[PDB]
A paper describes a structure:
Autophagy-related protein 18 (Atg18) participates in the elongation of early autophagosomal structures in concert with Atg2 and Atg9 complexes. Atg18 belongs to the protein family of β-propellers that bind polyphosphoinositides (PROPPIN). The corresponding primary structure contains a series of conserved WD40 repeats forming the 6 or 7 blades of a β-propeller fold. The autophagic membrane adapter Atg18 reveals an unexpected structural plasticity in multiple modes of oligomeric organization.
To further investigate the binding mode of Atg18 to lipid membranes, we mixed soluble Atg18 with PI3,5P2-doped large unilamellar vesicles (LUVs). The membrane surfaces are typically coated by disc-shaped particles corresponding to Atg18 β-propellers in dimension. When membranes are aligned in parallel, we found connecting density that we interpreted as Atg18 bridging two juxtaposed bilayers. The inter-membrane distance in the Atg18-WT and Atg18 s-loop samples was constant over parallel membrane stretches and very similar at ~80 Å, respectively, whereas no consistent inter-membrane spacing could be detected between undecorated 100% DOPC liposomes without Atg18. Further 3D subclassification resulted in a structure of two S-shaped densities packed against each other made up of eight disc-shaped densities with ~50 Å diameter each. In the density, we found Atg18 molecules in four pairs of dimers with a slightly twisted interface matching the observed I-interface of the tubular Atg18 assembly determined above. Notably in the cryo-EM density, the basic Atg18 dimer unit was found to assume a 45° tilt angle with respect to both membrane planes, which could be independently confirmed by measurements in raw tomogram slices. The rigid body fit of the Atg18 dimer was consistent with the location of the PI3P binding sites as well as the 6CD loop facing opposing membrane bilayers. The fitted Atg18 dimers lack the interaction through the T-interface due to PIP-binding.
Author numbering:
A (entry chain F), D (entry chain D), E (entry chain B): 5 to 65, 70 to 156, 222 to 321, 409 to 445, 458 to 500
B (entry chain E), C (entry chain C), F (entry chain A): 5 to 65, 70 to 156, 222 to 321, 409 to 445, 458 to 499
């Protein structure tokens, strides 16, 4: 079993991207299957648009500096761009392409592929970003630490006009994770303590929600919004996933992975639109069918976990199935 | 009489820097005199610190891109730095040195002279900034127009920590002039129409005062605060200089230059601390001495004009004397 | 005594430019003196125009690629230009500026300083050119070897119209030195063996004179014409300088340096206009005064040697005096 | 009927290339037929080697900047090279490939396809070139106008050693057309007046022949040598084609197109080796067969015209047939 | 090493055709080399004309019923013709193309490719044929067994006029092999016993020569004439090749394959025009050079064997070299 | 009186088959009578076996392509078979059934009626064959002209083994009529000019006899042998029937029809075994009885003519009686 270095959902959560030390893979979620694969070499960043057969490939070191965009349906190379330093993150929408280095931000137009704007930012060794995926509210946010309490400063940058809009005084400590909703309305961040989750409304700048996560300080791996902006997902080193309800404190519902899973695994999750499931097959503990929110949690060990959450009851979520990436 | 391309006061307003097409000169204000001069070449930017024998010299194009730092007392060269494009503005405090190109901002430590930060901004063909001269509140502000209504966006940048603090939605149109008080507390901005003057409190961001300037729209050359932040001075193409009182609308007092003066003159001004003047010599229209704020207005034609303002009466200001720079 | 890396006369031969590992110096010839000097850094190319306080300064590697134009009277910088590779030669007239890299030629207008033309040539590791200093016949010639017998092909390029005029099949072997007279009428070339010196008439292209140099093949350092195109001076590794008379084969007159001189010295020379010298002081072997052509030969060890040639007698030339540059 | 933008014979004159706004076509001459076609898009330059299934494709704007080499028999792409500006001409021999922009010349080796030499020339908005098609005498000539009487300067460049050989003082006015014989021995040029045709011997530089063309000044569209260097063909805006005999003034023989043809049409021609025709079928006005020089003249309207010339009589040439390109 | 299903010389013996289960190959004989190849699939019949880049391809099952004619130089398909049953043999000359099924004969004109004549013959499971390759004497002969001693009846069919010419009472038993000389003058046949070889003159019908082959009855694989009609070659299951002289019984000269070769291999041979060889290199056991008849024997295992025969001495033939088909 | 399209004897010559445009009829020869008749439709081919109540019926176009086998005694249908084109000839023996189209020959087993063989021949628009009626020597012969001098090539085909035996180069011109004796021993052929009659021995292939017919070339309608192969009968457009004696040139005996007969009549004949006739009734010009070979000649106009030939005298033959078929 080859080691994997990167997992990432698309901007809608209906697909899967992945990068191994021997190649990369592209899966699908509802009619599960291996859509694409290529065993060329180690890949560290595999980012794709809303399907559309568009990919962004960063080699593990094709070095980590070079970024290559490949159209999988045409099997051709759109362009290749090099960078002075290793790439730390690449994110995309159907309007702009952004490449982030440790102290610089590069912004490209996805169509023309010509360089547009460059931001000189204070060092970000963690490669933290968040991009609104919609063109109507195209906003990019990056942290602004002081150069050596005013450490958790985040710069709200509008990609449409290529000018900053405001400065958000997010937290006292360094930012550890950040995400933007699908429509670009909201924003969520968390310090390196992972104890307090804060939600700011990007257009006005007001803090809307403040959630407490866990009891003691522990690392946060990633944050992701629901597609309908109803729920927010956080994953940490405690091998537990929390879901906070944004329909408005304590986490609304929690996901516990199977015990056999090792605790030293990074997990990214995604929340999908509610679906109907047959209660006859699953003794939830009854109407024949009731709406269940499906949750997909994939870990760096190469597994996929499917949960269902009751929007009213919440609580601990039942687990339906456990596929295995890199195999059937 | 050689043509002059650049005039500015020092950060305290007690000195004069000037650049001709043949060299640069340095003057003084109260015991007027010519401290230094060199007939080296064309100079476009001659900026000085709080005396201290430190200068920034930019050639007319010594190219326009090159910047040279010279100690006038030692007649030596501290350093020499080049830039890919022509320099548009240079400002200093006793802690940081800022060089602005049309699209880039370079910040240097005044002591070590090593580069500290670089800012990629939207193009500024007008070379507009404002630098707080005090190290306690060292702030830099530069405009951020959208790249091709929200055209008059300005970025409040902190030099101490090298991180921006906030974004101020100053005006609807493009910014034309910026000025920061001596202590770095306030910032004043002017749109390209020069009809509304707005001053913001830099730490909070709230607009404190709003001034109406003149009757019709006309260009603004420069803005400058008083040492004690009591008054604000603006000069425009109407050949008239206005003084706005910040002790708290309409201009408090107006400076009318002599009629024979050319109308197409760049005019910069400065406000000094109140001093005692004898009313026996000057029929102000009476106690023997009364405090009157002295104002120095140097124009691009090469003349200095001294005025006095009565802080209570205000109104049209009397002119005492006129020298002639370059002579 | 710092090492020196570059010596050349001006386009009239009445001045000296020189570059050390610590700075550059500028001298004069008839009333000998040191006009200028700076201990800035290593300089590899120091080229001057017809006095006029204009210089081209190239750092030893200020990198070798960078070229800086400095006005010594104003102590300012006209401009600063970089190149992808190290500069190999720089020459000027009062109309054009030429910068040569190993495979590229850049031509600049001396006044506006904007780029005018670029020539892609076959590699020239020796950095060889020749520039006519008069604007009436402004010509540039550079060698064009085949890219890997016809190896000594040289391209006659007109700077005025920026179009080549003709191709001269100069020599069978690679070109080693090129020189153009003051008026731009003639061009002289030297093969890598230094045995045959050929001069061509640039407008017609016909070889006018052919000179045999020395007895055996040896390297040639530089060639230079007289102001009136009467004589041609070549210097080689044999520590001997030859003068060929163009008033029309064998060298007309030979310059033998003092024996104590090191043999491994780069030697450049120049020929000046005839002057009156007193035979009473100098027993030439007699009228009190007779015109004798003065020759100045500066070597890489740092010394200047003054000779005189009798235009009718020719022959071995007497040496009058010796100074010491850098002292 | 789609509009066509480019017509060009091969280096031997036994084939035809063509480019439309919808695709390109490749014909043949003696056993006439449509050898190849591809309706991809607009093409502006279609240049091919001596058969050998080698092509050079320049899109109308595959932009005009990009040049693509396609092997029609293998249906694959050998390589793709981009250029900063739009391409104005591409010519080839079995040794070198040259791409010309408005102020630059690029020279490539046809086999290795690596860049060899670059010439910085004065602006040529007309895209004028001439290449000897034989490797024994590989010479390339381009005009050298002054940069703003010495306007008609042409630089004779040897492609083998990549060094200029001489400078030719061709004409007083700007050069309008130029061509090189098959063996690379001769050269022919004409100013923008089109009144005087001059022939220079490329190896020595001497002007060998000087022909007068027409009476009043009129534009010249193209010049082409005969394969055996016996005759030279010029075509102008007068809807008339002249042939000058090089076996050595006034044009030896002239070709008049049918009256129905519009005068605002560009025509390129080619001269083939002499062939035997039966005088019984054609009342020339008699031996049964006598040698006739065949001439093929194709116009931008999409037609082909076949003429026969008597090398001794010359004069106005009889027209045998009139095919139609884009159809049968 | 892929298995091969078909080997056949051309009508002159100067080339080689071959068909594998993965593709087909085309070799050459005197300047030995691999002229062509194509790894598409299994091929059972690969027949080619006198060079001329013409091929006949029958798939192993492109089924065995379908026959496809491909021009290897043009890489195109001339035509495709289907048949109700599997093809058993295809032979060609520069005038006619004949396709044989188990009970039917189809004759086509090679140029026009339209059907001309069809012969309804009694069943021939062995696919036996013989065609004169010259247009002057275009004769086709096929066996005519009785439908269930008069079993070895062969019908002499003239392809030019498409009418039978005579009936030959060849042998008492079933015919096993048959061949026609290059000029179409002679004919040779052999029964399934392989003991007696009979030669009939096709124009008159008289039996000219009768040769005894071997001692006991054994199978005969193929018969081939010399180009000059001087010698006749037979190959059997005894791993031995006999040559009978037609300059006029017992075989004149015999060819013994190397012992390492397996006996269960089918061998086809061909006789070429006499050539000069240097006796200095080869100690034949002496003039420096003497004429030797070269013989090429290829077996179904994938090897080629070159022999030399002395026309006067005959006897056992020396073997010069042993190439290897499917490799160098 | 309906038109008649087809007349032929049986394989023994003791019966008559006939086809009208309204139906078919079957007669007898020695005790003359009408055995059978049906007014069904137009019939073009009515062929019978050796009595045995077996018939082959082809419609006039029951299309011309269709063939129907009918048993007249049972009034039933044995089978029905169609063909892609119109049938041109049908013949039988007691072992095989042959159907000929213009370019194809079909052979059927008379008993099982399953198809046995098919022959692809060059086109025969005249529908010519010859069938041996004995199973001991069952042979079929059909012409093989070249497909567009050797035009009269005929193929000897053996029905028993279904394989051809030999090819006979019969005549230079196209074959016009073929006939095989009762035992299948001999075959007779006639060219389109009808001048030369050739008979070949089918087993050996050698031409045995050659007969000259008439004086000038004229068409031949049919040929038929005697039962004992003693005589051969040919009928042509000259309204004269010739008898050639094969007991071994010029015709042995000639049959002249009555003058009133139409000249444009298809005439077929047959030769029977010798019988005893009374010379008292017939003045032959005498023993009371002498054997005379009876000849029956039925013509397309619908009449039967009875002749007698003296085997020794030969010569012109006397006519005894005339009936009228269809009445």
């Amino acid at each position: 079993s080859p080691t994997i270095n990167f997992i990432n959902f698309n901007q809608t959560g209906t697909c899967i991207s992945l990068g191994t030390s021997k190649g990369f893979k592209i899966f699908n979620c509802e009619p599960f299957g291996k859509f694409y694969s290529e065993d060329s070499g180690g890949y560290a960043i595999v980012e794709m648009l809303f399907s559309t057969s568009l990919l962004a490939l960063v080699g593990i070191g094709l070095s980590a500096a070079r970024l290559r965009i490949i159209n999988t349906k045409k099997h051709s190379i759109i362009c290749e761009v090099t960078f002075p330093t290793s790439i730390l993150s690449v994110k995309m929408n159907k309007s702009r392409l952004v490449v982030l280095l440790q102290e610089q931000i590069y912004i490209y137009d996805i169509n023309t592929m010509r360089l547009l704007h460059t931001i000189e930012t204070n060092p970000n060794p963690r490669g933290l970003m968040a991009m609104s995926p919609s063109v109507a509210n195209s906003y990019l946010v990056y942290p602004s630490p002081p150069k050596v309490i005013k450490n958790g400063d985040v710069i709200v940058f509008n990609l449409e006009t290529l000018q900053p809009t405001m400065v958000i005084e997010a937290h006292k400590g360094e930012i550890a994770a950040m995400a933007i909703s699908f429509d670009g309305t909201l924003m969520a961040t968390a310090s390196d303590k992972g104890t307090i989750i804060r939600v700011f409304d990007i257009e006005t700048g007001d803090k809307i929600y403040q959630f407490r996560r866990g009891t003691y300080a522990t690392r946060i791996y990633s944050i992701s919004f629901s597609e309908d902006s109803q729920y927010l997902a956080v994953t940490g080193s405690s091998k537990t996933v929390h879901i906070f309800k944004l329909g408005h404190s304590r986490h609304f519902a929690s996901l516990k992975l199977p015990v056999e899973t090792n605790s030293h695994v990074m997990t990214i999750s995604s929340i999908g639109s509610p679906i109907d499931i047959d209660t006859s097959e699953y003794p939830e503990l009854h109407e024949p069918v009731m709406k269940m929110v499906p949750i997909r949690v994939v870990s760096s060990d190469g597994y996929l976990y499917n949960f269902v959450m009751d929007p009213e009851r919440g609580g601990d979520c039942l687990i339906l199935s456990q596929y295995s990436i890199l195999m059937d």
